Amino acid sequence: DNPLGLIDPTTISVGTMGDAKPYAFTTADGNFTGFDIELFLNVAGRLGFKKEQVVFTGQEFSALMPSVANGRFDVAAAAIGTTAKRKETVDFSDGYLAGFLSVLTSEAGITDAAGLKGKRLGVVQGTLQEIYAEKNFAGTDLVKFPDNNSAVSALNNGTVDAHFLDFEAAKDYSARYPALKIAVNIPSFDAPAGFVIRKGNDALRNALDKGLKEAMQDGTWKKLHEKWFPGTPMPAAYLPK
Ligand SMILES: NC(=O)CC[C@H](NC[C@H](O)[C@@H](O)[C@H](O)[C@H](O)CO)C(=O)O
Ligand SMILES: [Ca+2]
């Protein structure tokens, strides 16, 4: 049978993204990796699904939740912030990561949120960054990008003054392009990352939640967090109790 309500009962089809390093990304061989991928794989194993039974498809961020809602994938995993607005379209698992939205700029760029008034700020279409900047960065010219790589290329070229993306990805790009630096950190603890599932696949949602709680309780979450986000604080909520 099919208790988890999957497209194929023998395989879990996961929608993800290739350029949200270190949450979710492709290595040079094309394989999907990163914290969110390794955490999902660990949770999927607890559900009785081996690595070979989980298939990852890379999509632009804006395509992920409509793809799950339209039955193209069973799950979506790509640091997808849990919000009321997104809960109208899709269901979410319990939160597994809460952190900052970050403004990445050039070596002689912006210093604070005030510095963004009248500047060109890059954003990935469909992200929480795009909503935040529309509500809190009025006067900043928002330049929409399909993904992080194109936005960083524009930032490196001087097309845009800054780029608004997730903290760990901003941190990763500042390591890959040493001239880049994080100028502003905005709290996004009210929107923790959750695995996205079809409205309302209660079986898969409850199964994902159980696997997540287990991975946090046995220190698996802690181990992956230490591996992918070195130096980032881990709250007691996601650590063993
Ligand atoms: N580009 C992406 O993959 C996702 C970007 C963006 N992530 C927001 C995060 O989920 C943020 O709210 C979290 O608190 C945390 O820092 C990482 O999941 C979003 O959901 O739109
Ligand atoms: Ca553009």
Side-chain angles (χ1 to χ4, degrees), residues 110-123:
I110 278 102
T111 190
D112 50 31
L116 295 172
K117 279 195 268 283
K119 301 281 166 67
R120 286 169 54 88
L121 178 70
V123 286

Side-chain angles (χ1 to χ4, degrees), residues 41-63:
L41 282 177
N42 188 88
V43 162
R46 296 170 194 264
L47 263 78
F49 288 87
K50 280 270 210 291
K51 189 177 196 287
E52 294 70 28
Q53 289 180 92
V54 183
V55 172
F56 296 100
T57 298
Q59 283 198 155
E60 279 172 28
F61 184 83
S62 61

